[PDB]
Design a protein around this ligand. Structure first.
Ligand SMILES: CCCCCCCCCC(=O)CSCCNC(=O)CCNC(=O)[C@H](O)C(C)(C)COP(=O)(O)OP(=O)(O)OC[C@H]1O[C@@H](n2cnc3c(N)ncnc32)[C@H](O)[C@@H]1OP(=O)(O)O
Ligand SMILES: CCCCCCCCCC(=O)CSCCNC(=O)CCNC(=O)[C@H](O)C(C)(C)COP(=O)(O)OP(=O)(O)OC[C@H]1O[C@@H](n2cnc3c(N)ncnc32)[C@H](O)[C@@H]1OP(=O)(O)O
Ligand SMILES: CCCCCCCCCC(=O)CSCCNC(=O)CCNC(=O)[C@H](O)C(C)(C)COP(=O)(O)OP(=O)(O)OC[C@H]1O[C@@H](n2cnc3c(N)ncnc32)[C@H](O)[C@@H]1OP(=O)(O)O
Ligand SMILES: [Cl-]
Ligand SMILES: [Cl-]
Ligand SMILES: [Cl-]
Lengths: 137, 137, 136, 138
């Protein structure tokens, strides 16, 4: 399964020394062609100085989970980031369960385009939305 | 001293249990009203799976260093992130020294606009540029 | 709501100001916080090489998202703070495009919207934008 | 310079068309140099929104076109096609105001080019908007 494989990727991230370690707490909900859903509980390690989800972590989720969606395509190339944007619509608080849903919008010869929504698991309310363009080598 | 105060903040960040810990390695060059310059050496903890500066860490640098520039204004409100964008123009390799320069572009009643350049310290070449809008206070 | 928006579109068509550059659009649906329009790409909409001009796409994102904001309880159009657009496929002269705008979140001072432009024939995304506006 | 003269004639020619490039007919070129272009424009009724300020979509159009001109003023000289563009709006440009649009090339490579554009009030220097624009070259 691409599900079995994405689980191994997440396991690898957890024990990493590099920056991939910061998402070690995420869990995989589903993988499908060009679509990945993960979930995460907001813990202290994920927060800023005021106890909400750090905007840089949100960016890191947008980046990594969209990259996972790209792994889940026929080409399966993760690429390198070219442009990313994130809009922050509601805070995510410590202890809240969040859902991160990534979709591939379009794949070309040298560029891929993805979108990510972070939502509150309980309410489905949008926390943030991001778009991420990657260059494929 | 504005620089000395901000240096102390950076030192505290280093000891944090929360996400602010991820920038523990940065050093402060200068603080002035609406302008902050930091430097960081890219180390393993900062990298992605291909050994370059992780795009989410770049995002976190844009976020935190622009927030520091807002702390260095008369109003001094850090705000909360509304929109951030980052463009990735060249990789920063493990062991490379980088400069992060943040400017406040405009401060209004309820919104502040900031921009950040990350450059290679040796060559001056642009690694990434971001813009970051925050809602005040 | 639909009738009001239809009239707005008629007014922009006849305008001397920049709102004129969309005169050629059709309202398909207006609902709470969601508007769907369509447009045939004509010469007036193209760049030097005859494809849909990126600034006109930007103008569609800006205007149609603002229309979605008009279709809310508050009904304030706001003023633009941040806009981004990702361009995925070209739209050629003569092609029909569907522009769908929706309100993601509304608050006291800020509103967030998203817009898709799609080729009607093929359903493929031409562009996607997001637009944050400040409310008075 | 010869470069400014060349670009000026490219602009005059391209803005006379029935196509969308016409909406920039009122811009004036100040200077073209390697990777950097400076234009100016007086905001008139045709440039405005329903509240009498510079229309956000025309600001985007200025960003797109003027950055593309900066790319033409390079050795590569490829205008490219837009991939990602963002704009941040800091202050209104009012009817009758002179604006300066300054575009510069940040970096270019084999297939991608990166540009940034500031719109400023000519008289006061203050920032109207700032955009960034990534284009695919081939
Ligand atoms: C059917 C009817 C529909 C018609 C639609 C027509 C309207 C749609 C057109 C539109 O979208 C215009 S968008 C054009 C491009 N964008 C801009 O020009 C936005 C520029 N950005 C800004 O002006 C600011 O950065 C702003 C977003 C307002 C910042 O907000 P904030 O920080 O909260 O406020 P400031 O500190 O800058 O200003 C506080 C307050 O004071 C006002 N003020 C004072 N003096 C002026 C002058 N001379 N001009 C304009 N405004 C002035 C500010 O406007 C602000 O007013 P608000 O309470 O509304 O924020
Ligand atoms: C150590 C030295 C100092 C260092 C400090 C550094 C800390 C930096 C913290 C930081 O930058 C956090 S950024 C995290 C990512 N961003 C976000 O989480 C922001 C998400 N977006 C939003 O919250 C909104 O979209 C908002 C920008 C606030 C929208 O603005 P507006 O429309 O004007 O506001 P709303 O109508 O949504 O909200 C009204 C107002 O009332 C509040 N509100 C609504 N609901 C709640 C709840 N449940 N709790 C608390 N407050 C609520 C909003 O907080 C808002 O307050 P203000 O406008 O006065 O700020
Ligand atoms: C299953 C588990 C495995 C999953 C692991 C996932 C790992 C994903 C990692 C990731 O996404 C890294 S993203 C980090 C942030 N982004 C960047 O660092 C990108 C910076 N931007 C660029 O490098 C350029 O702007 C680029 C997008 C490559 C520009 O494209 P283009 O114009 O086409 O290319 P260039 O002309 O710049 O370069 C051509 C070619 O040569 C390689 N190159 C050039 N210069 C360098 C330098 N200095 N160092 C290393 N490599 C260089 C370029 O990468 C490019 O190669 P490709 O043919 O592959 O495009
Ligand atoms: Cl934060
Ligand atoms: Cl990365
Ligand atoms: Cl406008």
């Amino acid at each position: 399964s691409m599900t079995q494989s994405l689980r191994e990727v997440i396991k690898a991230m957890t024990k990493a020394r590099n920056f991939e370690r910061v998402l070690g707490k995420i869990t995989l909900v589903s993988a499908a062609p060009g679509k990945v859903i993960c979930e995460m509980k907001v813990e202290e390690e994920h927060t800023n100085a005021i106890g909400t989800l750090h905007g840089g972590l949100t960016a890191t989720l947008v980046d990594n989970i969209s990259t996972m969606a790209l792994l889940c395509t026929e080409r399966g190339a993760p690429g390198v980031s070219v442009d990313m944007n994130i809009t922050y619509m509601s805070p995510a608080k410590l202890g809240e369960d969040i859902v991160i849903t990534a979709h591939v919008l379009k794949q070309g010869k040298t560029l891929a385009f993805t979108s990510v929504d972070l939502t509150n698991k309980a309410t489905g309310k949008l926390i943030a939305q991001g778009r991420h363009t990657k260059h494929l080598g």
